[PDB]
Design a protein around this nucleic acid. Structure first.
Ligand SMILES: [Mg+2]
Ligand SMILES: [Mg+2]
Ligand SMILES: [Mg+2]
Ligand SMILES: [Mg+2]
Ligand SMILES: [Mg+2]
Ligand SMILES: [Mg+2]
Ligand SMILES: [Mg+2]
Ligand SMILES: [Mg+2]
Ligand SMILES: [Mg+2]
Ligand SMILES: [Mg+2]
Ligand SMILES: [Mg+2]
Ligand SMILES: [Mg+2]
Ligand SMILES: [Mg+2]
Ligand SMILES: [Mg+2]
Ligand SMILES: [Mg+2]
Ligand SMILES: [Mg+2]
Ligand SMILES: [Mg+2]
Ligand SMILES: [Mg+2]
Ligand SMILES: [Mg+2]
Ligand SMILES: [Mg+2]
Ligand SMILES: [Mg+2]
Lengths: 55, 145, 182, 134
RNA sequence: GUAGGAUAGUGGCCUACCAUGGUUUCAACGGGUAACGGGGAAUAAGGGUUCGAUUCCGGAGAGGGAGCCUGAGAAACGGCUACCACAUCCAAGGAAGGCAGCAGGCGCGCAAAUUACCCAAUCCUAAUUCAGGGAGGUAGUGACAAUAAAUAACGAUACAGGGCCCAUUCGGGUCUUGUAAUUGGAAUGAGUACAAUGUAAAUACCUUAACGAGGAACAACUGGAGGGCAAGUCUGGUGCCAG
């Protein structure tokens, strides 16, 4: 089309029934854990949202 | 060099005058003074304006990126002036339709163009009392025709 | 027509949003002293900021001369009462550098955890929220209470409710009922 | 268990109004809420006043049961209490009766109507009756 | 200026007669203001800049402009008289009007609430303890703005991370942490609800009995995820399109 062709063309994938990421302070706690407590692995450098290791 | 401006202890009025004079080179200040917004500027120096959709018009974009930018020729209600409002997101123009009331907003640049869409200054926000973004989302539905 | 009830948009956002290091620091602070948001941190900063400003102002006049002497002294006293300032440090120029961490540490948030009671910061907070903990014999349920040091020894579990041990409390009752039925 | 530990803080004797006015302070340990009648009774027992001339208001309990902090007066007599205390208070107590009246708006309307007419209404009525034929 | 007139009184306020002054580049005069003035507001190193219709103080106005009665005090508009502009009621001869009080409607607009409850407070007026009061308060609507903070917490068992008595290979795991529709005991007020509190009467608050949490809920949205700038070289759909 020549008026929002792309929105109509895509396949609608459905929201997966995943568990709630808890609200308020819980989230903050989780974030903290992710950051400073657990300490993510680094070959040389830190990274917040890593990739599946590939090109 | 004493550097232009009078540094005397009683040279204050003159200084003030000079400052005032200078003020008329500053563009924003000038605008504020003369009421360019109140005398021109399709809107009445306002945030928004309701306007009637006269027709749907695809406008060809500036350069680099090449496309048709699905704008609308809007007639503002309060003044009677005629402007061109870009319509955001996928489709959206269909939703807007034709001869509808349409609540416009400024595009962002305190007047002026917005990037690539030449001769275009306004976002359509609401069409006949809803909201375009909302419509696009389908979080809220249109009130029929 | 009565009078405008006054307020302050007290607790103020930083001037840049995404100074990454700063953000990280904030997060760390939150983790340490179990906060719901950066908002709390900001508030704390503002509180401290004001104090710092006051100190600066005082300094900008001569210590010996009057307002500086008195007002500053009063401020120092207040700080001491709050329990952020130490007893070694009561020289105004010490207030100047108090730090937000110290402020955080003085909360009824942490003064539950520091005195045992809870076990694990968040838990303490939850307890405070849920109508336990009475600083006097009057039930505080604000986490950001700021304990008075003079009344830190007096922090107990509530006269009423469990843990203090007046009533067992709802789930327990249900269990008892079930047992009875059985 | 509790014993309704009542106190009477800030006692101002009032020869002008003919009363003892004061802050009622009261405790609940494990009971919750004191009740007004009970408070009055307690006051009477204390002061040798009788509920009839005791008169209490305000309060709002502290927070987390425990305490309550209202305002209580003990008049020099029942009669005195009656002729000084506002009517609402009396009604609350039970001493006086609730004053049965019309709605405020309605009253206003009535007043307006009255203003609109002149002299006695009897004449007006008569006139209306006369018209009735026309 | 002189004299009168007037005014409660000063005064070119007005009249008579005379003099030719008076203001001005230290911006007079004129024009504009999407200008009522100030207290103040926003911003906030210091200096500033912008805003001030709007809770207090002043000033104006009651559709416009005029005129006046009464009165200590009005050039009053919830007084009158006129003309203009707008409009109502009519048996056509004539009458009545003025929300920029409150509520409400249209209208305009991007843009703003109930035709509610009462004098209990606050104060006000009178012939006045006693009446009245859309001044004022009380709720209603209200994400204007502001403050305070719930949206699980502690277990156990079950699978993994960390200290390690010793590292002939193990491993107990003696000690501490995170993950599982396990499960279990302990609260919770958001809801509801006798009561009692409040209150003018009510609501609502605070106080309580009773019920009310286990992912199906007693469910957090908004924006973003190349840079500026916190965070995806993930997967597909697209293929100068639509965005
Ligand atoms: Mg190109
Ligand atoms: Mg309780
Ligand atoms: Mg004279
Ligand atoms: Mg102004
Ligand atoms: Mg004006
Ligand atoms: Mg003003
Ligand atoms: Mg205006
Ligand atoms: Mg005023
Ligand atoms: Mg009008
Ligand atoms: Mg007038
Ligand atoms: Mg009126
Ligand atoms: Mg008036
Ligand atoms: Mg009105
Ligand atoms: Mg609004
Ligand atoms: Mg009012
Ligand atoms: Mg509401
Ligand atoms: Mg709560
Ligand atoms: Mg999202
Ligand atoms: Mg996006
Ligand atoms: Mg994306
Ligand atoms: Mg980045």
């Amino acid at each position: 089309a020549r008026a929002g062709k792309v929105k109509s063309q895509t396949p609608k994938v459905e929201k997966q029934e995943k568990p709630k990421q808890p609200k308020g302070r819980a989230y903050k706690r989780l974030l903290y854990t992710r950051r400073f407590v657990n300490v993510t692995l680094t070959n040389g450098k830190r990274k917040m949202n890593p990739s599946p290791s590939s090109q | 060099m004493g550097k232009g401006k009078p540094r005397g202890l009683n040279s204050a009025r003159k200084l003030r005058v000079h400052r005032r004079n200078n003020r008329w080179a500053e563009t924003t200040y000038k605008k504020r003074l003369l009421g360019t917004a109140f005398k021109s500027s399709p809107f009445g120096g306002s945030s928004h304006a309701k306007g009637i959709v006269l027709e749907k018009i695809g406008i060809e974009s500036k350069q680099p990126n090449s496309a048709i930018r699905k704008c609308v020729r809007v007639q503002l209600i309060k003044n009677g002036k005629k402007v061109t409002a870009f319509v955001p997101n996928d489709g959206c123009l269909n939703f807007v339709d034709e001869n509808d009331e349409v609540l416009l907003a400024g595009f962002g640049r305190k007047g002026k163009a917005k990037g690539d869409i030449p001769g275009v200054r306004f976002k359509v926000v609401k069409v006949s009392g809803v909201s375009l973004l909302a419509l696009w989302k389908e979080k809220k539905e249109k009130p029929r025709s | 027509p009565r009078a405008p009830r006054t307020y302050s948009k007290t607790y103020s956002t930083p001037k840049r949003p995404y100074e990454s290091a700063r953000l990280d620091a904030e997060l760390k602070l939150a983790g340490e002293y179990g906060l719901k948001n950066k908002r709390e941190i900001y508030r704390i900063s503002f509180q401290l900021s004001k104090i710092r400003r006051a100190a600066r102002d005082l300094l900008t006049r001569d210590e010996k001369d009057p307002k500086r002497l008195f007002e500053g002294n009063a401020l120092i006293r207040r700080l001491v009462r709050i329990g952020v300032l130490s007893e070694d440090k009561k020289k105004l120029d010490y207030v100047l550098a108090l730090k937000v961490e110290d402020f955080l540490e003085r909360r009824l948030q942490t003064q539950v955890y520091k005195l045992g009671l809870a076990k694990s910061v968040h838990h303490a907070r939850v307890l405070i929220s849920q109508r336990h903990i009475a600083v006097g014999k009057q039930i505080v349920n604000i986490p950001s209470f700021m304990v008075r040091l003079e009344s830190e020894k007096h922090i107990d579990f509530a006269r009423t409710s469990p843990f203090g041990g007046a009533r067992p409390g709802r789930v327990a009752r249900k269990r008892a009922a079930a047992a009875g039925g059985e | 268990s509790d014993a309704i530990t009542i106190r009477t803080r800030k006692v101002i004797s009032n020869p002008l109004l003919a009363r003892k006015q004061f802050v009622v302070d009261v405790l609940h340990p494990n009971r919750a809420n004191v009740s007004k009648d009970e408070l009055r009774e307690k006051l009477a027992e204390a002061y040798k006043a009788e509920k009839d001339a005791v008169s209490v208001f305000g309060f709002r309990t502290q927070y987390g049961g425990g305490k309550s902090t209202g305002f209580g007066l003990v008049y020099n007599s029942v009669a005195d209490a009656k002729k000084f205390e506002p009517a609402y208070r009396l009604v609350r107590y039970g001493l006086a009766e609730k004053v049965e009246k019309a709605s405020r708006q309605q009253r206003k309307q009535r007043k307006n109507r009255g203003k609109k007419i002149f002299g006695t209404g009897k004449s007006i009525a008569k006139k209306a009756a006369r018209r009735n034929a026309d």
